[PDB]
């Protein structure tokens, strides 16, 4: 986690609040005296400063969201690899327990963004990626489990790592789409 | 003249005023409860609507200015042609009187925009164009005057029309630069 962005985000809201005031008054003085040269330009320069403040806010707010998502992402990432490298059906069962929820949270956040991404293509990648992720997390479990029981069947290891590979890919796919709009 | 834009411009200021309010409150509720999911999104959607309203305003305000300038422009335009086609040193002297001020007003407005245009090149065209305009309006007078005194000297007519041509060009140059930034 990193709340430096949540802190920055509030400060941003202040400038938007201050500028918003200066805008309100300049706007008022203009409405009462609309044929006024001076009063008008003051309203324009106000509107400009209000615009900068507002875009700086919207952009920053978007980072905050994407970032938040990416952190849940790196969590699930390391989980998948820790699940693969499990050496006992002990730690393996331990991990899967710790990871399942972390996969669910990531799934939720993922869904949300999916909604906000504008172009539908990206929205599809998100959906698809979240699907594979959803389906294989369990399968990777049963797969890397088998390898632990039949240590000499190279065929199982190959299978497991293929599932892991695809799973990791879905994770990045989610990350990739998440930064679309 | 056309004040439909001055009217539209006020209505525009209202939406910016209304949205500005909705922004202020959503912004406030967020600052008091910043870790809030809901309160936050409300602040974002507010900021969006505030942004549309503000840009719609700034653009419209810019048209209003450019348009205003263009109207003084069409005035000076017809003046220059009416000065050329004068048939007596009577009407000619009449026109020049009526036009001189109209050239000065146009000159003032021109100067202003010059300041606001961002890229310097355009700012130069404006300056240059305003210069030629400034210098030749008088010369066109003395020129189209001579033609009236020596009606059979094709050479004078040629000269006069050349001055008129250049003068008209400066006018359009002003118009052209004025719509730069």
From Swiss-Prot, chains A, B:
Compartmental location: Cytoplasm, Cytoskeleton; Cell junction, Adherens junction; Cell membrane; Cell junction
Region of interest (Involved in homodimerization), residue spans: 1-147
PTM info: Sumoylated.
Tissue expression notes: Expressed in cerebellum, heart, liver, small intestine, kidney and placenta (at protein level).
Region (Interaction with JUP and CTNNB1): 16-67
Subunit structure: Monomer and homodimer; the monomer preferentially binds to CTNNB1 and the homodimer to actin. Component of an cadherin:catenin adhesion complex composed of at least of CDH26, beta-catenin/CTNNB1, alpha-catenin/CTNNA1 and p120 catenin/CTNND1. Possible component of an E-cadherin/ catenin adhesion complex together with E-cadherin/CDH1 and beta-catenin/CTNNB1 or gamma-catenin/JUP; the complex is located to adherens junctions. The stable association of CTNNA1 is controversial as CTNNA1 was shown not to bind to F-actin when assembled in the complex.
Family from the record: Belongs to the vinculin/alpha-catenin family.
Function of the protein: Associates with the cytoplasmic domain of a variety of cadherins. The association of catenins to cadherins produces a complex which is linked to the actin filament network, and which seems to be of primary importance for cadherins cell-adhesion properties. Can associate with both E- and N-cadherins. Originally believed to be a stable component of E-cadherin/catenin adhesion complexes and to mediate the linkage of cadherins to the actin cytoskeleton at adherens junctions.
Protein name: Catenin alpha-1
Naturally occurring in which organism (per UniProt): Mus musculus
Lineage: Eukaryota, Metazoa, Chordata, Craniata, Vertebrata
Complete-protein stretch covered: 82 to 262 of 906
């Amino acid at each position: 986690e990193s709340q430096f962005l949540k802190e920055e985000l509030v400060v941003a809201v202040e400038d938007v609040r201050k500028q918003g005031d200066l805008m309100k008054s300049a706007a008022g003085e203009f409405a009462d005296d609309p044929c006024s040269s001076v009063k008008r330009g003051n309203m324009v320069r106000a509107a400009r400063a209000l615009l900068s403040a507002v875009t700086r806010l919207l952009i920053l707010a978007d980072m905050a969201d994407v970032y938040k998502l990416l952190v849940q992402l790196k969590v699930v990432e390391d989980g998948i690899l820790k699940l693969r490298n499990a050496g006992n059906e002990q730690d393996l069962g331990i991990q899967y327990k710790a990871l399942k929820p972390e996969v669910d949270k990531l799934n939720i956040m993922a869904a949300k963004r999916q909604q906000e991404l504008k172009d539908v293509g990206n929205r599809d990648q998100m959906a698809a990626a979240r699907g594979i992720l959803q389906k294989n997390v369990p399968i990777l479990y049963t797969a890397s489990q088998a390898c632990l029981q039949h240590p000499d069947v190279a065929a199982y290891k190959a299978n497991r790592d293929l599932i892991y590979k695809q799973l990791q890919q879905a994770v990045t796919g989610i990350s990739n789409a998440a930064q679309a709009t």
